[PDB]
Design a protein around this motif. Structure first.
Motif, mmCIF file in Angstrom:
data_model
loop_
_atom_site.group_PDB
_atom_site.id
_atom_site.type_symbol
_atom_site.label_atom_id
_atom_site.label_comp_id
_atom_site.label_asym_id
_atom_site.label_seq_id
_atom_site.Cartn_x
_atom_site.Cartn_y
_atom_site.Cartn_z
ATOM 1 N N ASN A 88 34.705 -23.629 45.317
ATOM 2 C CA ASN A 88 36.113 -23.986 45.414
ATOM 3 C C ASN A 88 37.034 -22.772 45.639
ATOM 4 N N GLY A 89 36.461 -21.604 45.934
ATOM 5 C CA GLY A 89 37.246 -20.396 46.171
ATOM 6 C C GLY A 89 37.440 -19.463 44.978
ATOM 7 N N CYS A 90 37.186 -19.925 43.753
ATOM 8 C CA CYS A 90 37.373 -19.070 42.568
ATOM 9 C C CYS A 90 36.163 -18.187 42.313
ATOM 10 N N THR A 91 36.275 -17.322 41.293
ATOM 11 C CA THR A 91 35.217 -16.380 40.909
ATOM 12 C C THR A 91 35.050 -16.323 39.398
ATOM 13 N N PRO A 115 33.363 -27.302 39.409
ATOM 14 C CA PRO A 115 33.075 -26.047 40.125
ATOM 15 C C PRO A 115 31.567 -25.883 40.359
#
Lengths: 83, 85
Positions: free
Chosen positions: B22-25, B2
């Motif tokens: 990658n789109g996560c938080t 990430p």
């Protein structure tokens, strides 16, 4: 020595699974990046539970088990799947 | 792996919100991190992304944190953690 899920939910508003870690941190992921959750309805996504000590995310009816450390490491499925 | 795409301090929740590439938080309370225990909200907002994108940087305060480390639950040197009796 590891982050461990204290709470987990599916936020319909932001379309994310929000995991509240036991050390005060938070991790969120869009469920349709995770192998197993493809085409799961909002209703189905809510069923999320915490298992392991607190290292696994579990969905009983869907029979899906995701590794929290794997997810936070960036692993959402098999090599074959991540393509 | 990430990697941090964006980073900011949210005064409301007193957390540093990190938007992963990658789109996560990932969100962590920065006052638990070594070198930021006494920083003010104002000072916390100066957060910057350095490294291909694996490091969070504060210029004026001269603090560098590892994103993977923070995500692993590591907030500082073991020497520092131990100096908390």
């Amino acid at each position: 020595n590891e982050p461990r899920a204290a709470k987990a939910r599916y936020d319909r508003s932001s379309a994310r699974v929000i995991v509240d870690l036991e050390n005060g941190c938070t991790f969120a992921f869009p469920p349709r990046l995770a192998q197993g959750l493809e085409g799961a309805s909002d209703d189905q996504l809510c069923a999320v539970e915490i298992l392991g000590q607190g290292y696994g995310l579990h969905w009983e009816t869907l029979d899906v088990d995701l590794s929290l450390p794997g997810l936070m490491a960036g692993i959402f499925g098999t090599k074959a799947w991540m393509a």
